[PDB]
Write a protein that binds this ligand. Structure first.
Ligand SMILES: O=C(O)CCCCC[C@@H]1SC[C@@H]2NC(=O)N[C@@H]21
Ligand SMILES: O=C(O)CCCCC[C@@H]1SC[C@@H]2NC(=O)N[C@@H]21
Ligand SMILES: O=C(O)CCCCC[C@@H]1SC[C@@H]2NC(=O)N[C@@H]21
Ligand SMILES: O=C(O)CCCCC[C@@H]1SC[C@@H]2NC(=O)N[C@@H]21
Lengths: 119, 119, 119, 119
């Protein structure tokens, strides 16, 4: 149930296709920051999750460069998919910017996004 | 410069190929945890980084499932590549395990790996 | 408006007293994990925040040991207080457990809690 | 063993005293960022750690405001103390800045510091 179009609390749009062997591919559009239009994303997910009530672990990356801009940074989202009447993807992310070795201590931002199918 | 074989402080193996369109593909071998043999990885990087002293932002994902074992989890590495005689990849990572809704608060581990390029 | 009794999405109870010079003191009671009853907490906060619409940065620590149990770990919450008709404290935390140097790679959990005054 | 003067890889200074009730108090001096002189710190640690080869869990907070400067932010260090001839404190930290509700997604930086005890 991972395949589809998802939105997070910020209005960003996440469009993924989950492959049978565990691949994630699609595009991401951020509603905030130095970003414009769509960006390519790639990731992986557990294609054979536990039988109990556990969620499905997954993660994907986005390098913020496309035909319009390049913010010289990348974000990785790590979390888990929870199915049901109202499916959700709960994640925590790391946004690393390219920096000089002198500013490397303040290169990574951390946060959390929650995706649902309701625009 | 990113393309090659790398190893982190734990003795883990990272073999990657950086595509011209910003894609990263390869395999990862962890020296620790519930894992064995090689796992597929996919990521993205900044294919047009700043021509200054800044690092190259990148990130990649590994879902801990192959033809031999499944740990129902996924790790994402976010960081930057710093070129030169002694090429290094400094990262911070998030490892999320699939869990029941009740144990969700303790599903994500955080850490940091430093990779050194071989030969 | 920081002083008072707060609750997070897990049902945990946070009781703080903000001192004029920026000190935070109180007790914490977790609704989950190897915890029982109240634990002492101490922290700091910006006692002279910006004039614009910015929140108030703050943070506190809790070592999980009291008269009843000792989980040999500590959590630090870092975030910001947002006042108004419906005040909230948005945070992200790091839970570090004491471990052998061999398991140090999986010693820290990361998450996020949102506190409000509604039990 | 925790009580003393420490320094991290950035050249920052950490002077702390570990109380018998699990309390940590002292001052911190950062070698980088929008800060100058000493800042008050407070934290907690496990005063009854495991008698094995495990580290001692601890954490502390610093709100970046003193009688000379105010950066409207707060950092929390979470980690463990490892005793011996070469005592070390390995940490991971969260630095949260006060921001308007619109810039909240980029309010928290994440990193890691390693402290070495002097003399
Ligand atoms: O501005 C920057 O520093 C980089 C440009 C991209 C910023 C978008 C970030 S990624 C995490 C967060 N989730 C989301 O949906 N948008 C933001
Ligand atoms: O055991 C588990 O919970 C999951 C499988 C093992 C995960 C290994 C982790 S990934 C981050 C870290 N870097 C590395 O090289 N090995 C560890
Ligand atoms: O079980 C453990 O590993 C340690 C015992 C304490 C666990 C409580 C954690 S702290 C972060 C989170 N927020 C909250 O309110 N409760 C949990
Ligand atoms: O500039 C700011 O945004 C805040 C004031 C400077 C903060 C310094 C940070 S705290 C974590 C890190 N460790 C250290 O020793 N110095 C840096």
């Amino acid at each position: 149930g991972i395949t589809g179009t998802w939105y997070n609390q910020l209005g960003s749009t996440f469009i993924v296709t989950a492959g049978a062997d565990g691949a994630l591919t699609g595009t991401y559009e951020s509603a905030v920051g130095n970003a414009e239009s769509r960006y390519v994303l790639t990731g992986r997910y557990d294609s054979a999750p536990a039988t109990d009530g556990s969620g499905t672990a997954l993660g994907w990356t986005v390098a913020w460069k496309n035909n319009y801009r390049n913010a010289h940074s990348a974000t990785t989202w790590s979390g888990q998919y929870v199915g049901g009447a109202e499916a959700r993807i709960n994640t925590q992310w790391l946004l690393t910017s390219g920096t000089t070795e002198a500013n490397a201590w303040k290169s990574t931002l951390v946060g959390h996004d929650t995706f649902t199918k309701v625009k």
